[PDB]
Structures are given as structure tokens and as C-alpha cells.
Write a protein that binds this DNA or RNA. Sequence first.
DNA 1: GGATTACACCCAAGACACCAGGCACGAGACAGAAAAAAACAACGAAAACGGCCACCACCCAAACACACCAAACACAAGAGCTAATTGACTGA
Length: 103
Amino acid sequence: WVRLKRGIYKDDIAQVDYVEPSQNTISLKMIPRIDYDRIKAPPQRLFDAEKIRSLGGDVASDGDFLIFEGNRYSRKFLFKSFAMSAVITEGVKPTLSELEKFR
DNA sequence: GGATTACACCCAAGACACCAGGCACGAGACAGAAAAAAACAACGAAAACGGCCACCACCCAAACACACCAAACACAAGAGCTAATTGACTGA
């Protein structure tokens, strides 16, 4: 488990889903902090595929897969590649609440 | 009560007479003195250690002066007016 360093997704839990042996970027599952193209011309909430299909805009639909604003790849839950130096791979140590989310 | 008159008494002057203790004179002797050998004590010739005293500091202890300094500066009352962040950096 890691946490991203920059962007709007700073200092939130990201589960390392796949580790790419290219040693440039790795696959991370993360909770989208997005407004679903309604306010921008926020709290971590479960992604809504139907709402992001209804509101329109930049969207590419592959059933459970979605490519949306920011070239964001999500499935079912964002699944996207982020740099190893753009995340902290040592020193997360999660609790049970994030495990439920992901002496 | 010293002096006068009257009265009693005894003891030394005045002789002799036995004899013997002190004086003229002579002799052994011991205190005393000249002299020698040798200390020696109050009369001077000097001092040299306890007794004052001054340099050269300390040594605290204010006196003064200089500057630094922090706090104080009448009540109330009405109104208007302006500002309460703004470049800008950096993922996207």
C-alpha cells in the first residue's frame, strides 16, 4: 500500500494492484476524489459509473471499465499507473478501515 | 615636814702586828706585720636585639556620573470611509 505525492490525489491510500517490472510506473487502485463533472466547469466516495455516463463529457465505456476526465482508468474504483517516485512505497501501515475499503 | 634640840650608838682613825699578794725584773711564746702570689668589684671604654615606622601594594566600599529605560499622558458622543491578501508555481 502506498500514497500518491502530487496532483489532487495527495496523501490518500492507494493499493498496489500490479507491480510493473519496467520500474517506471506501477498499478494502483484508488478512490476517485472527483465531482463527476457537475461542479467544476471533495470527500472520498465510491465511484459511480452510471452517474458519469449520465453527466457526459469525456468518457469511454468498456462495461466495468471507464476512461474519463484526466485520462483516468477505472474499473468496477480507479486502476491507473503512477510513478514509483511519485508515491511512497515504504511507511503506510494501514488500519482495518482502509482494509475494508481495499501488544 | 625640814629644822632644832636632845639622845643613842657604832665603827673607822690611830697605833701595833702577821704575812702574803702584787711589782721590778727576766723568759717562753703567739698575734701581728713585711712581703710575696693571687684574685676581683665597682670604676669606666664600647655595643646589638626588641622597638618604632615608613613604602607598596591590596582591598573592599561607597560617590558620582553617564547612559539606558519603561511607563504615563481627560471624559463622553455622533458620523463617514477604507480594507480586511496577491503574485505565482506547478501539476494537468
